[PDB]
Amino acid sequence: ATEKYYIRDAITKPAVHHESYQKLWETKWKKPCEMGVYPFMFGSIKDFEPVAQEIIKKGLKEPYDWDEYAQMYFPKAEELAKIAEEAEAAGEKEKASEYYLRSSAVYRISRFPTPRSEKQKYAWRKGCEVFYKGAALMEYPIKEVRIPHKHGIEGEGDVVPVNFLLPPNASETSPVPCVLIITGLDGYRTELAVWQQGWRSKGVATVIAEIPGTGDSPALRQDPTSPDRQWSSVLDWIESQKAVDSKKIVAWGFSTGGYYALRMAHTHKDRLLATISLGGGAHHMFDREWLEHANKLEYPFDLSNTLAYKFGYPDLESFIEESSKFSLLNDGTLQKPCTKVLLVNGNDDEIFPIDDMFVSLENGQPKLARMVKGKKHMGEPESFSIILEWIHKLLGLDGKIKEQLAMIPS
């Protein structure tokens, strides 16, 4: 196991944040919260610090009671929503928008890593409600679209709920590129929404969709082909929006979403100008050895158990027994021709192995790659500059990526 992967014996070193919530907060989450970046986009340290202090006093830690855990966030979430409602009634739209999104952030963290209890499932519905109230009051409002899942089969949901933002003056006469953002294991369309205004400012439409077994994805969790059907429904809908240039659709997968971006470069080659996998996997992410170690590494909670739940399995062992069938190597995806693919990740990733970038480069057509040495999952911050520079060149945008990136921190 310690000899198998690029990061070698790093796989056997438990991360301190698994000891307690206090360690998660102090060593991992307080800093991104203060800076207003993932997983705290649209959030404020003023909102989370009081909640953190109360959770730390209770001494909460793995194994978490997700109902007990989620409830700690609700008083603050509700407080922010009431301030938003009062601002809206008073006509203070900018203030109303801010506090609805701050409320959505508190609900979001309450149901991290994924809704696995009734209060977390409640937090997902409440978070979406206040997110879309805040989004509606943005200068350039972001809309929910319930895309008909026309490619759905028996047991699948009837809609693919997405975020949609179309730049002003976009039309069938003057159509715009579209970045299709594919979200991750924990961050859903209410989180990656933080990218949409930046793209709008550069004359680019955005659609944000969740991967199977997360958010409101209608896809069968255990069926490796369920994403294929979902993207057929989503791309049919984008094609029907004549203000979008269907020859300029770029799919950007974040995290776990990277697997789906890489997969759809093959399954939907002729409908996508390019796909990007940022911190994605392909094959070794489904290994027993990888999954049996990743619960205790850089991921804030239990990565492997969360992954198992998202793939529709009642426990990790049941997932590991079957996980090989999701491999893009094993199922033959990587032998197929692909559209333009860009692979970016930190070499030292302890969520998905850099070894899967190698597997991706070992099969089918050549793919663009940037490895980020000495960085873990997503290879930030340089990964964002690499990807924006490449998309700006691909779509002939203004190339002003610093201006776009500056809009991300809340």
mmCIF file of C-alpha atoms in Angstrom:
data_model
loop_
_atom_site.group_PDB
_atom_site.id
_atom_site.type_symbol
_atom_site.label_atom_id
_atom_site.label_comp_id
_atom_site.label_asym_id
_atom_site.label_seq_id
_atom_site.Cartn_x
_atom_site.Cartn_y
_atom_site.Cartn_z
ATOM 1 C CA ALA A 1 0.000 0.000 0.000
ATOM 2 C CA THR A 2 2.791 2.472 1.082
ATOM 3 C CA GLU A 3 4.734 1.576 -2.166
ATOM 4 C CA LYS A 4 1.718 1.565 -4.590
ATOM 5 C CA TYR A 5 0.986 5.322 -5.179
ATOM 6 C CA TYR A 6 3.042 8.468 -6.095
ATOM 7 C CA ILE A 7 2.689 9.911 -2.492
ATOM 8 C CA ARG A 8 4.173 6.617 -1.046
ATOM 9 C CA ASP A 9 3.915 6.388 2.830
ATOM 10 C CA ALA A 10 2.048 9.786 3.107
ATOM 11 C CA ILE A 11 -1.066 7.485 2.799
ATOM 12 C CA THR A 12 -0.423 6.042 6.373
ATOM 13 C CA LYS A 13 -0.099 9.459 8.190
ATOM 14 C CA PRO A 14 -3.442 10.433 9.852
ATOM 15 C CA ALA A 15 -4.379 14.169 9.467
ATOM 16 C CA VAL A 16 -4.806 16.055 12.819
ATOM 17 C CA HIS A 17 -8.257 17.535 11.813
ATOM 18 C CA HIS A 18 -9.904 14.034 12.248
ATOM 19 C CA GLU A 19 -9.143 14.198 16.046
ATOM 20 C CA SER A 20 -11.963 16.773 16.735
ATOM 21 C CA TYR A 21 -14.032 19.645 15.221
ATOM 22 C CA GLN A 22 -11.655 21.977 17.195
ATOM 23 C CA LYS A 23 -8.704 20.587 15.106
ATOM 24 C CA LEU A 24 -10.784 20.785 11.844
ATOM 25 C CA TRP A 25 -11.599 24.484 12.647
ATOM 26 C CA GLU A 26 -8.142 25.580 13.978
ATOM 27 C CA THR A 27 -5.906 23.713 11.409
ATOM 28 C CA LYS A 28 -8.106 23.630 8.217
ATOM 29 C CA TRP A 29 -11.421 25.620 8.166
ATOM 30 C CA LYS A 30 -10.903 28.909 10.150
ATOM 31 C CA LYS A 31 -8.439 30.297 7.484
ATOM 32 C CA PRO A 32 -10.637 29.669 4.358
ATOM 33 C CA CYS A 33 -13.683 30.957 6.382
ATOM 34 C CA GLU A 34 -11.878 34.284 7.235
ATOM 35 C CA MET A 35 -10.847 34.564 3.506
ATOM 36 C CA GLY A 36 -14.448 33.757 2.347
ATOM 37 C CA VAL A 37 -13.327 30.901 -0.006
ATOM 38 C CA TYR A 38 -14.444 27.223 -0.416
ATOM 39 C CA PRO A 39 -16.129 25.777 1.453
ATOM 40 C CA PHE A 40 -17.187 29.233 2.863
ATOM 41 C CA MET A 41 -18.068 31.107 -0.420
ATOM 42 C CA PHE A 42 -20.754 33.850 0.237
ATOM 43 C CA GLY A 43 -20.059 33.306 4.003
ATOM 44 C CA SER A 44 -18.661 35.464 6.868
ATOM 45 C CA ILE A 45 -16.300 34.567 9.802
ATOM 46 C CA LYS A 46 -18.779 36.754 11.835
ATOM 47 C CA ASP A 47 -21.441 34.004 11.204
ATOM 48 C CA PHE A 48 -19.314 30.787 11.516
ATOM 49 C CA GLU A 49 -16.958 31.719 14.455
ATOM 50 C CA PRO A 50 -19.808 31.842 17.061
ATOM 51 C CA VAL A 51 -21.118 28.424 15.774
ATOM 52 C CA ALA A 52 -17.562 26.902 15.759
ATOM 53 C CA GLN A 53 -17.006 28.094 19.402
ATOM 54 C CA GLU A 54 -20.342 26.424 20.455
ATOM 55 C CA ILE A 55 -19.457 23.128 18.588
ATOM 56 C CA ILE A 56 -15.921 23.144 20.190
ATOM 57 C CA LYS A 57 -17.479 23.640 23.711
ATOM 58 C CA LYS A 58 -19.647 20.482 23.039
ATOM 59 C CA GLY A 59 -16.406 18.658 21.994
ATOM 60 C CA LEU A 60 -18.032 17.162 18.821
ATOM 61 C CA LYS A 61 -15.720 14.774 16.848
ATOM 62 C CA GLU A 62 -15.733 11.636 14.584
ATOM 63 C CA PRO A 63 -17.871 9.634 14.636
ATOM 64 C CA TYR A 64 -20.293 12.625 14.210
ATOM 65 C CA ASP A 65 -24.057 12.458 14.979
ATOM 66 C CA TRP A 66 -25.132 14.388 11.825
ATOM 67 C CA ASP A 67 -28.522 15.505 13.350
ATOM 68 C CA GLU A 68 -26.713 16.734 16.549
ATOM 69 C CA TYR A 69 -24.009 18.333 14.292
ATOM 70 C CA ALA A 70 -26.364 20.006 11.728
ATOM 71 C CA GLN A 71 -28.637 21.527 14.476
ATOM 72 C CA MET A 72 -25.608 23.560 15.812
ATOM 73 C CA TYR A 73 -25.779 25.726 12.583
ATOM 74 C CA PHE A 74 -29.602 26.327 12.394
ATOM 75 C CA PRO A 75 -30.018 29.252 14.896
ATOM 76 C CA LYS A 76 -27.362 31.304 12.940
ATOM 77 C CA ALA A 77 -28.763 30.205 9.502
ATOM 78 C CA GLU A 78 -32.305 31.334 10.616
ATOM 79 C CA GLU A 79 -30.967 34.644 12.134
ATOM 80 C CA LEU A 80 -29.303 35.582 8.765
ATOM 81 C CA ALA A 81 -32.465 34.640 6.731
ATOM 82 C CA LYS A 82 -34.638 36.963 8.946
ATOM 83 C CA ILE A 83 -32.131 39.890 8.448
ATOM 84 C CA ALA A 84 -32.331 39.186 4.636
ATOM 85 C CA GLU A 85 -36.210 39.203 4.659
ATOM 86 C CA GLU A 86 -36.246 42.589 6.541
ATOM 87 C CA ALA A 87 -33.678 44.118 4.080
ATOM 88 C CA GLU A 88 -35.808 42.972 1.055
ATOM 89 C CA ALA A 89 -39.051 44.439 2.585
ATOM 90 C CA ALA A 90 -37.121 47.751 3.190
ATOM 91 C CA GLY A 91 -36.010 47.671 -0.519
ATOM 92 C CA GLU A 92 -32.304 47.101 0.429
ATOM 93 C CA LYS A 93 -31.762 44.517 -2.390
ATOM 94 C CA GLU A 94 -27.896 44.454 -2.117
ATOM 95 C CA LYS A 95 -28.194 43.791 1.693
ATOM 96 C CA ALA A 96 -31.054 41.210 1.268
ATOM 97 C CA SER A 97 -28.929 39.328 -1.376
ATOM 98 C CA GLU A 98 -25.818 39.259 0.930
ATOM 99 C CA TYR A 99 -27.715 37.889 4.017
ATOM 100 C CA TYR A 100 -29.706 35.211 2.017
ATOM 101 C CA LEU A 101 -26.340 33.926 0.616
ATOM 102 C CA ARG A 102 -24.714 34.131 4.131
ATOM 103 C CA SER A 103 -27.701 32.010 5.397
ATOM 104 C CA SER A 104 -27.184 29.551 2.437
ATOM 105 C CA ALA A 105 -23.484 29.202 3.496
ATOM 106 C CA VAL A 106 -24.397 28.236 7.128
ATOM 107 C CA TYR A 107 -27.042 25.659 5.939
ATOM 108 C CA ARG A 108 -24.420 24.323 3.418
ATOM 109 C CA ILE A 109 -21.717 23.542 6.074
ATOM 110 C CA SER A 110 -24.411 21.935 8.354
ATOM 111 C CA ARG A 111 -24.929 19.235 5.599
ATOM 112 C CA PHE A 112 -21.188 18.761 4.752
ATOM 113 C CA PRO A 113 -19.804 16.360 3.763
ATOM 114 C CA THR A 114 -23.100 15.052 2.199
ATOM 115 C CA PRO A 115 -26.677 14.884 3.612
ATOM 116 C CA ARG A 116 -26.711 11.515 5.532
ATOM 117 C CA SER A 117 -29.375 12.466 8.179
ATOM 118 C CA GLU A 118 -32.899 14.034 8.121
ATOM 119 C CA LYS A 119 -31.649 17.424 9.525
ATOM 120 C CA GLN A 120 -28.858 17.512 6.837
ATOM 121 C CA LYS A 121 -31.472 16.649 4.091
ATOM 122 C CA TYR A 122 -33.611 19.503 5.599
ATOM 123 C CA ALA A 123 -30.504 21.822 5.535
ATOM 124 C CA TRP A 124 -30.020 21.048 1.762
ATOM 125 C CA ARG A 125 -33.663 22.086 0.973
ATOM 126 C CA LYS A 126 -33.478 25.207 3.270
ATOM 127 C CA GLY A 127 -30.010 26.190 1.881
ATOM 128 C CA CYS A 128 -31.272 25.957 -1.760
ATOM 129 C CA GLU A 129 -34.369 28.054 -0.805
ATOM 130 C CA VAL A 130 -32.308 30.980 0.689
ATOM 131 C CA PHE A 131 -29.528 30.609 -1.991
ATOM 132 C CA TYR A 132 -32.088 31.231 -4.808
ATOM 133 C CA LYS A 133 -33.720 34.153 -2.868
ATOM 134 C CA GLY A 134 -30.214 35.749 -2.636
ATOM 135 C CA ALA A 135 -29.387 34.820 -6.283
ATOM 136 C CA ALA A 136 -32.681 36.448 -7.521
ATOM 137 C CA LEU A 137 -31.558 39.783 -5.887
ATOM 138 C CA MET A 138 -28.066 39.793 -7.555
ATOM 139 C CA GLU A 139 -27.546 42.713 -10.048
ATOM 140 C CA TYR A 140 -27.392 39.929 -12.731
ATOM 141 C CA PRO A 141 -29.745 37.282 -11.218
ATOM 142 C CA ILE A 142 -28.779 33.540 -11.283
ATOM 143 C CA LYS A 143 -31.897 31.359 -12.010
ATOM 144 C CA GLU A 144 -32.788 27.727 -11.172
ATOM 145 C CA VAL A 145 -33.749 25.758 -14.343
ATOM 146 C CA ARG A 146 -35.411 22.311 -13.846
ATOM 147 C CA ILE A 147 -34.097 20.756 -17.126
ATOM 148 C CA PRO A 148 -36.439 17.953 -18.324
ATOM 149 C CA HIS A 149 -34.491 14.641 -17.907
ATOM 150 C CA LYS A 150 -35.737 13.384 -21.339
ATOM 151 C CA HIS A 151 -32.840 10.792 -21.432
ATOM 152 C CA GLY A 152 -33.798 9.447 -17.940
ATOM 153 C CA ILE A 153 -34.726 5.724 -17.556
ATOM 154 C CA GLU A 154 -36.871 3.888 -14.911
ATOM 155 C CA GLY A 155 -35.977 4.855 -11.279
ATOM 156 C CA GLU A 156 -34.472 8.269 -12.306
ATOM 157 C CA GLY A 157 -35.791 11.774 -11.449
ATOM 158 C CA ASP A 158 -37.739 13.721 -14.120
ATOM 159 C CA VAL A 159 -35.528 16.911 -13.952
ATOM 160 C CA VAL A 160 -31.841 18.025 -13.776
ATOM 161 C CA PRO A 161 -31.977 21.163 -11.545
ATOM 162 C CA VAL A 162 -29.169 23.605 -12.619
ATOM 163 C CA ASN A 163 -28.036 27.202 -12.007
ATOM 164 C CA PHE A 164 -28.199 29.330 -15.205
ATOM 165 C CA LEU A 165 -26.692 32.806 -15.875
ATOM 166 C CA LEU A 166 -26.791 34.396 -19.378
ATOM 167 C CA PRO A 167 -24.710 37.569 -19.962
ATOM 168 C CA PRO A 168 -26.674 40.709 -20.999
ATOM 169 C CA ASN A 169 -27.031 41.274 -24.808
ATOM 170 C CA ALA A 170 -26.452 37.509 -25.469
ATOM 171 C CA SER A 171 -28.853 36.529 -28.325
ATOM 172 C CA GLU A 172 -29.310 34.036 -31.225
ATOM 173 C CA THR A 173 -27.780 36.872 -33.376
ATOM 174 C CA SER A 174 -24.760 37.266 -30.976
ATOM 175 C CA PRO A 175 -24.502 33.929 -29.102
ATOM 176 C CA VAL A 176 -22.008 33.392 -26.216
ATOM 177 C CA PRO A 177 -19.828 30.470 -25.051
ATOM 178 C CA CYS A 178 -21.092 28.416 -22.057
ATOM 179 C CA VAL A 179 -18.994 26.967 -19.188
ATOM 180 C CA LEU A 180 -20.833 23.883 -17.822
ATOM 181 C CA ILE A 181 -19.564 23.624 -14.191
ATOM 182 C CA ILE A 182 -19.792 20.054 -12.765
ATOM 183 C CA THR A 183 -19.744 20.201 -8.921
ATOM 184 C CA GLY A 184 -18.188 17.750 -6.418
ATOM 185 C CA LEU A 185 -18.870 15.344 -3.519
ATOM 186 C CA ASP A 186 -19.730 18.142 -0.981
ATOM 187 C CA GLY A 187 -19.922 21.481 -2.926
ATOM 188 C CA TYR A 188 -23.109 21.576 -5.096
ATOM 189 C CA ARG A 189 -24.646 24.190 -7.500
ATOM 190 C CA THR A 190 -25.230 26.582 -4.495
ATOM 191 C CA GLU A 191 -21.395 26.564 -3.860
ATOM 192 C CA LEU A 192 -19.811 26.654 -7.385
ATOM 193 C CA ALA A 193 -22.358 29.483 -8.133
ATOM 194 C CA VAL A 194 -19.465 31.757 -6.892
ATOM 195 C CA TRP A 195 -17.841 31.399 -10.422
ATOM 196 C CA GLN A 196 -20.927 32.544 -12.433
ATOM 197 C CA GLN A 197 -20.670 36.409 -12.148
ATOM 198 C CA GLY A 198 -16.967 36.249 -13.227
ATOM 199 C CA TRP A 199 -17.896 34.283 -16.405
ATOM 200 C CA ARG A 200 -20.886 36.649 -17.041
ATOM 201 C CA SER A 201 -18.457 39.671 -16.821
ATOM 202 C CA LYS A 202 -16.314 38.011 -19.605
ATOM 203 C CA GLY A 203 -19.359 37.390 -21.910
ATOM 204 C CA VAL A 204 -19.703 33.663 -20.959
ATOM 205 C CA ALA A 205 -22.951 31.865 -19.935
ATOM 206 C CA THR A 206 -22.807 29.324 -17.042
ATOM 207 C CA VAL A 207 -24.805 26.156 -16.264
ATOM 208 C CA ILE A 208 -24.021 24.389 -12.918
ATOM 209 C CA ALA A 209 -25.088 20.707 -12.475
ATOM 210 C CA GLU A 210 -24.411 18.164 -9.667
ATOM 211 C CA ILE A 211 -22.859 14.684 -10.160
ATOM 212 C CA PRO A 212 -24.965 11.522 -9.575
ATOM 213 C CA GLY A 213 -25.827 10.793 -5.890
ATOM 214 C CA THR A 214 -25.330 14.472 -4.816
ATOM 215 C CA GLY A 215 -27.621 17.553 -4.522
ATOM 216 C CA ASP A 216 -30.720 17.081 -6.769
ATOM 217 C CA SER A 217 -29.085 14.845 -9.469
ATOM 218 C CA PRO A 218 -31.824 12.528 -10.849
ATOM 219 C CA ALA A 219 -29.170 9.902 -11.897
ATOM 220 C CA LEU A 220 -29.129 6.246 -10.625
ATOM 221 C CA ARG A 221 -26.265 6.185 -8.042
ATOM 222 C CA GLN A 222 -24.930 2.635 -8.770
ATOM 223 C CA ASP A 223 -25.188 2.752 -12.638
ATOM 224 C CA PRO A 224 -21.875 3.950 -14.212
ATOM 225 C CA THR A 225 -23.837 5.110 -17.365
ATOM 226 C CA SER A 226 -26.307 7.382 -15.376
ATOM 227 C CA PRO A 227 -24.067 10.510 -15.874
ATOM 228 C CA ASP A 228 -24.100 9.868 -19.692
ATOM 229 C CA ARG A 229 -27.953 10.178 -19.713
ATOM 230 C CA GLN A 230 -27.832 13.293 -17.437
ATOM 231 C CA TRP A 231 -25.364 15.135 -19.774
ATOM 232 C CA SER A 232 -27.498 14.160 -22.849
ATOM 233 C CA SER A 233 -30.491 15.943 -21.129
ATOM 234 C CA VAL A 234 -28.341 18.980 -20.079
ATOM 235 C CA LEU A 235 -26.648 19.405 -23.521
ATOM 236 C CA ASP A 236 -30.070 18.995 -25.301
ATOM 237 C CA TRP A 237 -31.319 21.898 -23.080
ATOM 238 C CA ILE A 238 -28.204 24.117 -23.697
ATOM 239 C CA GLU A 239 -28.592 23.439 -27.493
ATOM 240 C CA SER A 240 -32.260 24.703 -27.201
ATOM 241 C CA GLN A 241 -30.979 28.052 -25.678
ATOM 242 C CA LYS A 242 -30.143 29.902 -28.972
ATOM 243 C CA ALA A 243 -28.376 32.764 -27.037
ATOM 244 C CA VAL A 244 -25.672 30.085 -26.287
ATOM 245 C CA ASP A 245 -23.220 28.992 -29.049
ATOM 246 C CA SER A 246 -23.540 25.142 -28.786
ATOM 247 C CA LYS A 247 -20.122 24.822 -30.599
ATOM 248 C CA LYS A 248 -18.491 26.676 -27.595
ATOM 249 C CA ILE A 249 -19.530 24.529 -24.559
ATOM 250 C CA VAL A 250 -16.629 23.965 -22.079
ATOM 251 C CA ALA A 251 -17.247 21.471 -19.196
ATOM 252 C CA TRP A 252 -15.172 22.234 -16.025
ATOM 253 C CA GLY A 253 -15.348 19.480 -13.341
ATOM 254 C CA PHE A 254 -14.262 20.475 -9.786
ATOM 255 C CA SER A 255 -13.038 17.740 -7.501
ATOM 256 C CA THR A 256 -15.034 14.532 -7.856
ATOM 257 C CA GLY A 257 -16.693 16.456 -10.754
ATOM 258 C CA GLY A 258 -13.356 16.052 -12.625
ATOM 259 C CA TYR A 259 -14.120 12.301 -13.144
ATOM 260 C CA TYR A 260 -17.396 13.344 -14.902
ATOM 261 C CA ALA A 261 -15.666 16.098 -16.997
ATOM 262 C CA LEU A 262 -13.039 13.505 -18.158
ATOM 263 C CA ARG A 263 -15.754 10.825 -18.787
ATOM 264 C CA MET A 264 -18.015 13.188 -20.846
ATOM 265 C CA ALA A 265 -15.024 14.317 -23.046
ATOM 266 C CA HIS A 266 -15.413 10.734 -24.483
ATOM 267 C CA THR A 267 -19.201 10.036 -24.130
ATOM 268 C CA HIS A 268 -20.198 13.526 -25.507
ATOM 269 C CA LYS A 269 -17.028 14.304 -27.592
ATOM 270 C CA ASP A 270 -18.989 15.842 -30.556
ATOM 271 C CA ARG A 271 -21.083 18.187 -28.281
ATOM 272 C CA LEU A 272 -18.180 19.730 -26.211
ATOM 273 C CA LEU A 273 -15.396 22.138 -27.346
ATOM 274 C CA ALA A 274 -13.323 21.077 -24.259
ATOM 275 C CA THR A 275 -13.482 19.529 -20.765
ATOM 276 C CA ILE A 276 -11.321 20.306 -17.683
ATOM 277 C CA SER A 277 -10.723 17.933 -14.725
ATOM 278 C CA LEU A 278 -9.442 19.862 -11.635
ATOM 279 C CA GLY A 279 -8.520 17.394 -8.834
ATOM 280 C CA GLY A 280 -10.428 14.540 -10.550
ATOM 281 C CA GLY A 281 -9.750 10.777 -10.693
ATOM 282 C CA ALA A 282 -10.384 7.939 -13.189
ATOM 283 C CA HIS A 283 -9.249 4.483 -11.871
ATOM 284 C CA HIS A 284 -7.030 4.218 -8.709
ATOM 285 C CA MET A 285 -9.633 6.413 -6.847
ATOM 286 C CA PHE A 286 -11.718 3.125 -6.834
ATOM 287 C CA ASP A 287 -8.811 0.976 -5.408
ATOM 288 C CA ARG A 288 -9.320 -0.892 -2.069
ATOM 289 C CA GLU A 289 -5.831 0.339 -0.942
ATOM 290 C CA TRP A 290 -6.599 4.025 -1.792
ATOM 291 C CA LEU A 291 -10.169 3.969 -0.301
ATOM 292 C CA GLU A 292 -9.040 2.082 2.895
ATOM 293 C CA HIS A 293 -6.541 4.966 3.655
ATOM 294 C CA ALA A 294 -8.288 8.177 2.340
ATOM 295 C CA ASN A 295 -10.826 8.411 5.299
ATOM 296 C CA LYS A 296 -7.915 9.656 7.546
ATOM 297 C CA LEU A 297 -6.122 12.050 5.077
ATOM 298 C CA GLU A 298 -6.574 15.667 3.838
ATOM 299 C CA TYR A 299 -10.402 15.476 3.283
ATOM 300 C CA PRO A 300 -12.156 17.200 6.265
ATOM 301 C CA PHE A 301 -14.476 14.179 7.043
ATOM 302 C CA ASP A 302 -14.686 10.489 5.887
ATOM 303 C CA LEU A 303 -13.951 10.716 2.097
ATOM 304 C CA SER A 304 -14.275 6.946 1.311
ATOM 305 C CA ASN A 305 -17.559 6.438 3.304
ATOM 306 C CA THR A 306 -19.008 9.656 1.694
ATOM 307 C CA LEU A 307 -17.922 8.424 -1.799
ATOM 308 C CA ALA A 308 -19.595 5.009 -1.024
ATOM 309 C CA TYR A 309 -22.895 6.769 -0.020
ATOM 310 C CA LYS A 310 -22.806 8.957 -3.213
ATOM 311 C CA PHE A 311 -22.375 5.721 -5.330
ATOM 312 C CA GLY A 312 -25.474 4.214 -3.571
ATOM 313 C CA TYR A 313 -23.747 1.677 -1.214
ATOM 314 C CA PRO A 314 -24.725 1.196 2.477
ATOM 315 C CA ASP A 315 -21.042 0.917 3.690
ATOM 316 C CA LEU A 316 -17.407 1.214 2.405
ATOM 317 C CA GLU A 317 -16.810 -2.595 2.052
ATOM 318 C CA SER A 318 -19.938 -3.013 -0.211
ATOM 319 C CA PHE A 319 -18.629 -0.095 -2.410
ATOM 320 C CA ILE A 320 -15.021 -1.507 -2.600
ATOM 321 C CA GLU A 321 -16.480 -4.930 -3.682
ATOM 322 C CA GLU A 322 -18.016 -3.236 -6.810
ATOM 323 C CA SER A 323 -16.018 0.064 -7.198
ATOM 324 C CA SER A 324 -13.870 -1.318 -10.132
ATOM 325 C CA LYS A 325 -16.939 -0.982 -12.494
ATOM 326 C CA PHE A 326 -16.766 2.901 -12.262
ATOM 327 C CA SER A 327 -13.115 2.970 -13.506
ATOM 328 C CA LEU A 328 -12.810 4.869 -16.862
ATOM 329 C CA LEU A 329 -10.016 2.329 -17.671
ATOM 330 C CA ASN A 330 -12.032 -0.841 -16.745
ATOM 331 C CA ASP A 331 -15.302 0.275 -18.496
ATOM 332 C CA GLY A 332 -13.350 1.150 -21.712
ATOM 333 C CA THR A 333 -14.119 4.947 -21.678
ATOM 334 C CA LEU A 334 -10.388 5.954 -21.954
ATOM 335 C CA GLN A 335 -9.946 3.853 -25.199
ATOM 336 C CA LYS A 336 -12.540 6.102 -26.986
ATOM 337 C CA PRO A 337 -11.634 9.343 -28.832
ATOM 338 C CA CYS A 338 -12.034 12.524 -26.677
ATOM 339 C CA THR A 339 -12.622 16.252 -27.333
ATOM 340 C CA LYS A 340 -9.925 18.662 -25.977
ATOM 341 C CA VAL A 341 -9.113 17.601 -22.343
ATOM 342 C CA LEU A 342 -7.124 19.594 -19.719
ATOM 343 C CA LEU A 343 -6.022 17.688 -16.545
ATOM 344 C CA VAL A 344 -4.790 19.791 -13.547
ATOM 345 C CA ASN A 345 -4.008 18.575 -9.991
ATOM 346 C CA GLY A 346 -1.502 18.793 -7.116
ATOM 347 C CA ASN A 347 0.947 15.815 -7.150
ATOM 348 C CA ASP A 348 0.422 15.240 -3.372
ATOM 349 C CA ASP A 349 -3.450 14.908 -3.609
ATOM 350 C CA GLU A 350 -4.701 12.572 -0.772
ATOM 351 C CA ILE A 351 -8.375 12.687 -1.992
ATOM 352 C CA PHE A 352 -7.771 11.301 -5.546
ATOM 353 C CA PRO A 353 -4.275 10.062 -6.542
ATOM 354 C CA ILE A 354 -2.090 11.923 -9.135
ATOM 355 C CA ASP A 355 -1.597 8.282 -10.390
ATOM 356 C CA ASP A 356 -5.042 8.744 -12.103
ATOM 357 C CA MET A 357 -3.632 11.696 -14.146
ATOM 358 C CA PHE A 358 -0.991 9.139 -15.350
ATOM 359 C CA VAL A 359 -3.731 6.522 -16.166
ATOM 360 C CA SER A 360 -5.587 9.339 -18.075
ATOM 361 C CA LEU A 361 -2.336 10.097 -20.051
ATOM 362 C CA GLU A 362 -1.611 6.313 -20.589
ATOM 363 C CA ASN A 363 -4.788 5.676 -22.715
ATOM 364 C CA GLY A 364 -6.430 6.983 -25.943
ATOM 365 C CA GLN A 365 -5.531 10.408 -27.427
ATOM 366 C CA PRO A 366 -3.016 12.905 -25.947
ATOM 367 C CA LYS A 367 -4.462 15.239 -23.244
ATOM 368 C CA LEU A 368 -3.262 18.661 -21.957
ATOM 369 C CA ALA A 369 -1.834 18.417 -18.397
ATOM 370 C CA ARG A 370 -0.402 20.703 -15.687
ATOM 371 C CA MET A 371 0.906 18.899 -12.560
ATOM 372 C CA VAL A 372 1.345 21.160 -9.471
ATOM 373 C CA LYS A 373 4.378 19.818 -7.511
ATOM 374 C CA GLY A 374 4.315 20.134 -3.670
ATOM 375 C CA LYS A 375 0.520 20.867 -3.562
ATOM 376 C CA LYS A 376 -2.340 18.502 -2.508
ATOM 377 C CA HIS A 377 -5.978 18.272 -3.824
ATOM 378 C CA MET A 378 -6.716 20.790 -6.691
ATOM 379 C CA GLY A 379 -3.126 22.281 -6.692
ATOM 380 C CA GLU A 380 -4.447 25.758 -5.634
ATOM 381 C CA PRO A 381 -4.055 28.584 -6.152
ATOM 382 C CA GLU A 382 -1.974 28.222 -9.408
ATOM 383 C CA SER A 383 -4.505 25.641 -10.840
ATOM 384 C CA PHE A 384 -7.225 28.377 -11.209
ATOM 385 C CA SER A 385 -4.837 30.705 -13.180
ATOM 386 C CA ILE A 386 -3.682 27.773 -15.429
ATOM 387 C CA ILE A 387 -7.331 26.836 -16.263
ATOM 388 C CA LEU A 388 -8.697 30.422 -16.756
ATOM 389 C CA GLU A 389 -5.670 31.295 -19.005
ATOM 390 C CA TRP A 390 -6.413 28.186 -21.174
ATOM 391 C CA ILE A 391 -10.240 28.808 -21.396
ATOM 392 C CA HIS A 392 -9.620 32.533 -22.277
ATOM 393 C CA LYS A 393 -7.289 31.388 -25.148
ATOM 394 C CA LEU A 394 -9.765 28.641 -26.289
ATOM 395 C CA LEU A 395 -12.807 31.030 -26.402
ATOM 396 C CA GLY A 396 -10.892 34.214 -27.487
ATOM 397 C CA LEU A 397 -11.868 36.165 -24.295
ATOM 398 C CA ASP A 398 -10.069 39.343 -23.003
ATOM 399 C CA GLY A 399 -7.438 37.188 -21.138
ATOM 400 C CA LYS A 400 -7.947 39.347 -17.966
ATOM 401 C CA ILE A 401 -7.940 36.337 -15.561
ATOM 402 C CA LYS A 402 -6.668 38.324 -12.476
ATOM 403 C CA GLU A 403 -9.817 40.542 -12.728
ATOM 404 C CA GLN A 404 -12.049 37.393 -12.924
ATOM 405 C CA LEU A 405 -10.264 35.534 -10.029
ATOM 406 C CA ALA A 406 -10.530 38.630 -7.713
ATOM 407 C CA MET A 407 -14.390 38.286 -7.833
ATOM 408 C CA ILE A 408 -14.244 34.810 -6.081
ATOM 409 C CA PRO A 409 -13.353 35.728 -2.422
ATOM 410 C CA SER A 410 -16.569 36.812 -0.544
#
